[PDB]
Curated annotation (Swiss-Prot):
Family named by the database record: Belongs to the bacterial zinc-metallophospholipase C family.
Consequence when changing E174D: In strain: IAM 1208
Disulphides: none
Native source organism of the sequence: Bacillus cereus
Protein name per its UniProtKB record: Phospholipase C
Catalysed reactions, as listed in the record: a 1,2-diacyl-sn-glycero-3-phosphocholine + H2O = phosphocholine + a 1,2-diacyl-sn-glycerol + H(+)
Main function: Required, with sphingomyelinase, to effect target cell lysis (hemolysis).
First-tier enzyme category under EC: hydrolase
Gene that encodes the chain: plc
Length: 245
């Protein structure tokens, strides 16, 4: 997903997915300790910094190849042979965040949590779980899709407090893998001969540009809602793990 601006949801789907996940935690009145939501906002600057850094600097963006932002659950690999992938990279920062949290270094803890949230966010994007990059055919489709997503995401906010509490085990890796498994299933609903064709023709016909946008919207909405619920449960797991209990 996009992350064009460090502090604005308008062009940052990643931040939007997290803010909505936090809203799910606020809406929950039976399980979530609201003190946790208070902490996230208290260190919101470090959180958002982490969410944004993943796409603009090393080692997070792997020299502009973003190899660590992909993870195919079937073979457990990214699109580049022998490169680091999203599951191990996301888990890495989840743990680094927790250790800094236990040493009372909040700035460090939430920066790292932000990075981890970014990776978990990417595997909910079908293309990232199937190694379809911006250079994959049709080229340019990957980024134009993620840009289009920012214009319609607000129509798919989860308005209840039911996140996927303890969705997977206690190992962050299981959550990233589990999320990628679900996103890869919805891959075909976004990337297929039709969308490929219309996206190519869209170049010379405004008529087609709208055609693929419409075709990918339903599945996009479904992917966005899941991402919010899984992220909410992921954040809750982090706090239960390092929250000193
Ligand atoms: C100018 C063309 C770059 C387009 C692009 O979508 O780059 C970032 C994504 C993956 O990262 P995510 S978190 S979904 O980043 C989307 C936002 N931007 C483009 C601003 C980093 O990586 C690629 O598809 C690999 C090939 C690069 C030419
Ligand atoms: Zn992304
Ligand atoms: Zn992408
Ligand atoms: Zn990314």
């Amino acid at each position: 997903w996009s992350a064009e601006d460090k502090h604005k949801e308008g062009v940052n789907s990643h931040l939007w997915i997290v803010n909505r996940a936090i809203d799910i935690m606020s809406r929950n009145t039976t399980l979530v300790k609201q003190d946790r939501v208070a902490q996230l906002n208290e260190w919101r600057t470090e959180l958002e910094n982490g969410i944004y850094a993943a796409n603009y600097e090393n080692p997070y963006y792997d020299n502009s190849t973003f190899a660590s932002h992909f993870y195919d659950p079937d073979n457990g690999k990214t699109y580049i042979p022998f490169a680091k992938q999203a599951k191990e990279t996301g888990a890495k920062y989840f743990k680094l965040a927790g250790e800094s949290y236990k040493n009372k270094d909040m700035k460090q803890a939430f920066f790292y949590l932000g990075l981890s949230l970014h990776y978990l966010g990417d595997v909910n994007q079908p293309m990232h779980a199937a190694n379809f990059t911006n250079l994959s055919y049709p080229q340019g489709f990957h980024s134009k899709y993620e840009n289009f997503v920012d214009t319609i995401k607000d129509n798919y906010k989860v308005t209840d407090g039911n996140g996927y509490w303890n969705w997977k085990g206690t190992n962050p890796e299981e959550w990233i893998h589990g999320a990628a498994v679900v996103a890869k299933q919805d891959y075909s609903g976004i990337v297929n001969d039709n969308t490929k064709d219309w996206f190519v023709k869209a170049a010379v016909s405004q008529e087609y540009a709208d055609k693929w946008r419409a075709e990918v919207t339903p599945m996009t909405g479904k992917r966005l809602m899941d991402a919010q619920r899984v992220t909410a449960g992921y954040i809750q797991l982090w706090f239960d793990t390092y929250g000193d209990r």
